[PDB]
Amino acid sequence: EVPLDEQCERPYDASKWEFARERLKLGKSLGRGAFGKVVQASAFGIKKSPTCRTVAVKMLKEGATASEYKALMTELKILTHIGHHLNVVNLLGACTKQGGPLMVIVEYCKYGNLSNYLKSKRKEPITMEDLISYSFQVARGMEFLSSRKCIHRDLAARNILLSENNVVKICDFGLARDIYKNPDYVRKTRLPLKWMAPESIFDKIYSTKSDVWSYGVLLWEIFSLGGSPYPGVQMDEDFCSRLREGMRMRAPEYSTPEIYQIMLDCWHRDPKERPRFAELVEKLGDLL
Ligand SMILES: O=C(Nc1ccc(Cl)cc1)c1ccccc1NCc1ccncc1
Ligand SMILES: [Cl-]
């Protein structure tokens, strides 16, 4: 019944994750929010390995209050009781010394997000097999998250990061996403409207079945080679009523009838009747 994040106020295992702040050299920025940032760092000894590694580190900005501290502490807890999984950004350790700055350390994804990457081809030539691979990996990563009672709530290509070997990883910049600027978030709070299921928009209801909707838009994002959803549409009270009225996007340019079919399934009015992430993995498995 209880989503993972609200359930994560009821056990941190420093025994396992605590990592000395002296072992980090903090470096260039990767993302600034209002009260949070992510920076690149080099860690010596992460995971009990006396080697040297590049990691990404999320941490509070000045101006941040105890609220954001609690938020980042909830993110850490979540990342600790997850796994991890090839297609999710993996936790590597944390700094939590009382008195010291909170820092969440995860694996570094060298090639940025997937939207930008596909746009960079919209250095090798991209193929249909590639697009399907990425779609399948994200679906695999979401089947993992779902099965952990974890609702993402902002799934979209800007939140899929590209690692080595063509592996893609689900992340969330969270407090470190700049959202004042990004036109992907509209004042309603500012929300990723274009990626949200109708029931989330209207009743403020979120669930794995609403992540599936967003996964649908994500697929549109991928098979348009990093295009933005509902292109040429503005975002007002009217954009909704339509959306709640069977109104959907047309197939993107590099998609297949078969793959379009899949987005439409994800965009069913009734959430109870959108596919589970398990069937998405199988369908696409079948196309690989
Ligand atoms: O994505 C992050 N956390 C997150 C939160 C929720 C979920 Cl489902 C998956 C991951 C995150 C956690 C700590 C530090 C950086 C982070 N993300 C952005 C980053 C940028 C570069 N390479 C890896 C991640
Ligand atoms: Cl560690």
UniProtKB/Swiss-Prot annotation:
Post-translational modification note: N-glycosylated. Ubiquitinated after VEGFA-mediated autophosphorylation, leading to proteolytic degradation.
Biological-process GO terms, alphabetical: blood vessel morphogenesis; cell differentiation; cell migration; cell surface receptor protein tyrosine kinase signaling pathway; cellular response to vascular endothelial growth factor stimulus; embryonic morphogenesis; hyaloid vascular plexus regression; monocyte chemotaxis
Record-annotated active site: 154
Effect of residue 58 to M: Abolishes enzyme activity. Abolishes interaction with PLCG
Single annotated GO MF: placental growth factor receptor activity
Stated induction or repression of this protein's expression: Up-regulated in coculture of VSMC/endothelial cell (EC) or by direct exposure to VEGF of VSMC monoculture. Up-regulated from the second trimester of pregnancy to the term and in the placenta of women with preeclampsia (PE). Up-regulated in monocytes exposed to bacterial lipopolysaccharide (LPS).
Keywords assigned: Angiogenesis, ATP-binding, Cell membrane, Chemotaxis, Cytoplasm, Developmental protein, Differentiation, Disulfide bond, Endosome, Glycoprotein, Immunoglobulin domain, Kinase, Membrane, Nucleotide-binding, Phosphoprotein, Receptor, Repeat, Secreted, Signal, Transferase, Transmembrane, Transmembrane helix, Tyrosine-protein kinase, Ubl conjugation
Positions that bind ATP: 30-38, 58
Residues recorded as bearing Phosphotyrosine in the entry: 111, 185
Free-text tissue specificity from the UniProt record: Detected in normal lung, but also in placenta, liver, kidney, heart and brain tissues. Specifically expressed in most of the vascular endothelial cells, and also expressed in peripheral blood monocytes. Isoform 2 is strongly expressed in placenta. Isoform 3 is expressed in corneal epithelial cells (at protein level). Isoform 3 is expressed in vascular smooth muscle cells (VSMC).
Domain Protein kinase, first and last residues per copy: 24-288
GO cellular component, one term: actin cytoskeleton
Domain notes: The second and third Ig-like C2-type (immunoglobulin-like) domains are sufficient for VEGFA binding.
Family, per entry: Belongs to the protein kinase superfamily. Tyr protein kinase family. CSF-1/PDGF receptor subfamily.
Noted disease: Can contribute to cancer cell survival, proliferation, migration, and invasion, and tumor angiogenesis and metastasis. May contribute to cancer pathogenesis by promoting inflammatory responses and recruitment of tumor-infiltrating macrophages.
Role this protein plays: Tyrosine-protein kinase that acts as a cell-surface receptor for VEGFA, VEGFB and PGF, and plays an essential role in the development of embryonic vasculature, the regulation of angiogenesis, cell survival, cell migration, macrophage function, chemotaxis, and cancer cell invasion. Acts as a positive regulator of postnatal retinal hyaloid vessel regression. May play an essential role as a negative regulator of embryonic angiogenesis by inhibiting excessive proliferation of endothelial cells. Can promote endothelial cell proliferation, survival and angiogenesis in adulthood.
Subunit structure: Interacts with VEGFA, VEGFB and PGF. Monomer in the absence of bound VEGFA, VEGFB or PGF. Homodimer in the presence of bound VEGFA, VEGFB and PGF. Can also form a heterodimer with KDR. Interacts (when tyrosine phosphorylated) with CBL, CRK, GRB2, NCK1, PIK3R1, PLCG, PSEN1 and PTPN11. Probably also interacts with PTPRB. Interacts with RACK1. Identified in a complex with CBL and CD2AP.
Name this polypeptide is given: Vascular endothelial growth factor receptor 1
Native organism: Homo sapiens (Human)
Full-protein interval shown: 803 to 1158 of 1338
